[PDB]
Design a protein around this ligand. Sequence first.
Ligand SMILES: Cc1nn(C)c(O)c1C(=O)c1ccc2c(c1C)n(C(C)C)c(=O)n2C
Ligand SMILES: Cc1nn(C)c(O)c1C(=O)c1ccc2c(c1C)n(C(C)C)c(=O)n2C
Ligand SMILES: [Co+2]
Ligand SMILES: [Co+2]
Lengths: 379, 379
Amino acid sequence: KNPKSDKFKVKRFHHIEFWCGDATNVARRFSWGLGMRFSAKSDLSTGNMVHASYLLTSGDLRFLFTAPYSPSLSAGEIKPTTTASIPSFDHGSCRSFFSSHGLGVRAVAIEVEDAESAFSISVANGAIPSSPPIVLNEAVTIAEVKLYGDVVLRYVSYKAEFLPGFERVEDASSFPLDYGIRRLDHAVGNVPELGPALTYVAGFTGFHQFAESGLNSAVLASNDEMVLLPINEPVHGTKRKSQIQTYLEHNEGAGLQHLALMSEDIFRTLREMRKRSSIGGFDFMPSPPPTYYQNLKKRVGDVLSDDQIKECEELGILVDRDDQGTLLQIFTKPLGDRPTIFIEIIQRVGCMMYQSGGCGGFGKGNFSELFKSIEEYEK
Amino acid sequence: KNPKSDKFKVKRFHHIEFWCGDATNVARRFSWGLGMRFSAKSDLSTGNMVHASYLLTSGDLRFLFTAPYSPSLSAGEIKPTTTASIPSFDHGSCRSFFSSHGLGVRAVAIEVEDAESAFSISVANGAIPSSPPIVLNEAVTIAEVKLYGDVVLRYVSYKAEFLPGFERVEDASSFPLDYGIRRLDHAVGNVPELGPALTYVAGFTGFHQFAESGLNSAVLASNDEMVLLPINEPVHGTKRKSQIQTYLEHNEGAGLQHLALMSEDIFRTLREMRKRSSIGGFDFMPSPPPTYYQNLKKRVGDVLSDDQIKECEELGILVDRDDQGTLLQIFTKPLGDRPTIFIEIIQRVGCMMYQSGGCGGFGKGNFSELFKSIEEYEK
Ligand SMILES: Cc1nn(C)c(O)c1C(=O)c1ccc2c(c1C)n(C(C)C)c(=O)n2C
Ligand SMILES: Cc1nn(C)c(O)c1C(=O)c1ccc2c(c1C)n(C(C)C)c(=O)n2C
Ligand SMILES: [Co+2]
Ligand SMILES: [Co+2]
């Protein structure tokens, strides 16, 4: 059941912004590890005396990495005279965020028809304002409201080329890496209490709820279910400590837990990423035992051939099924020093009309199947 | 003239420590860009609840990357019960350093015969103490005094395997990269006033002075001239703004300007580094004009063949000569967001007895020769 209750017109995920201590080193690491190209910059060389911002792209996926300069470089500026390309940026907020949480996502940005209307409707419906709507070069409008913890939901709308004040990256520094990642599928938050978090976000967006292990969760979705925002809470008192609780402890509270990146060829993406794990890229969680891939024949034997199942086993890929589609997924180890944010690589098969959002679910069935596999491999 | 006036026995450079916001991403970027292997760690997985520290090695070169965890993880600890592997570490100092200077060198570490005696003699001779001598597992002693700005000179001595509490890195995560870098040749500081900086450092070490462009500089050296610590000050009032002054502005004061890394085969190192510049590694300063390499025939035609001169031209390598040896060198663009710290790759030819320290100088003649080359190429 999809009541299509969005309180304003939402299009697609637009970008994810990481707040960093040094944007250069994080962006270069991510570029090589994920196969994303350097496509735009806003920094000292573009006249920005406030923050260094670097944009990586793969397909429609946009990752922005931002760090503050010394405040002394811009001490004479005021907001009317700022050289910052992102007017919501604040030195103190960024330093406070990074000292509190470490490397992590500050903004989940969605493209909307009208960022000023989106902001006004959200705040009229309970959203806590973070940055009021600001029109950039009479071309783009940006506004921000609080999502959870110190993460903001950023609205971007275009009258008619990332943002004004960003420059295209020169082709010499713009090596055309591509491991097959094409877009953001979903962005997941961890909170101490799921109920109040869901009520708050669904309250100001009109997003609807989309259709033992240490977590309870729920998924909020836009009208066409292309913007997907799951939220998790921990389950206490279990034998094994909840990984959601571990997140909250090491992150100093609520924040973004994982980004799921859709691949157009998850086999190629994982081959390319795994080749680079020990040479500057990303590590992956330990692979399931062979009993898992043996049991996959009975579960997904009508969707994947035996060869493709064998290809899943080489790469450590997980498979899950809903009533409408099938999910291939795998998880990285945490992206930085703290056991907090990580990345999921996903590919979905089924639900063709284009492919509808959330085809195959989010893999919650893999908890029990991994468990059964571990017990079976112990035998 | 070498008066051999060291006030305590100094051996060699031991390691360089960077203070980071996220040590994982910086260390992974540096590993791929410079061809250094992950060799040791001290972090949550080794019981360290205080800081994450990762050691990269290439030959005798040791780069350490350290970042703080949330103070909440260690809030119940006191110094007698600390889980930190580097007892001088302090959360507040590290956050203050990074917010002030950005990514940069906190410690220049030299191995000495007795770190406690080195500390006591230094402080008795004017050194400002930073961290008193601490014996680690009855095996290693570490102590720190201020060098310039917020950079410390760290003394390490071994009774008889980086530091106690560091664990060797498992071979799966330890990919054997190697682009030919073998050791630290020199470490250079930028200060506002050279005189007082030299007097201070030479005062407490007994290091001696080793044998138009925007800088004045001088080099301090240990007895065998294997530890080399140049210091620069800006020259004001020139047409072009001093790059030393630019450093001081963007760094918020004095600090380490560049690390010069000796290669056993600078041609291989530069081929390997340049292949990776646009895929996560390091960029290099713009190459000199072809008139430079034409003029090199008359300057170094007796040391390098025409083919090897042509190889220098492909890779953008600079060449300088002293009275005793020849210097091949090249400089990276800044390592992070700010126009502050960069790296020099160096190889020295001549002065064989082993090779004596500082063979060929430090390349100051390349200022005039680059200038002449630029005017000649304008023609
Ligand atoms: C669950 C869940 N709910 N929603 C809305 C999602 O997007 C998810 C997941 O992406 C997911 C699915 C299966 C997992 C898993 C995750 C994070 N992890 C990590 C290590 C915790 C596992 O070990 N397994 C087996
Ligand atoms: C000088 C100097 N003194 N000492 C003690 C050193 O180690 C040096 C250098 O390493 C050096 C030599 C030549 C240079 C240079 C540097 C840093 N730069 C940078 C961009 C400023 C140039 O453009 N040229 C031509
Ligand atoms: Co997921
Ligand atoms: Co040098």
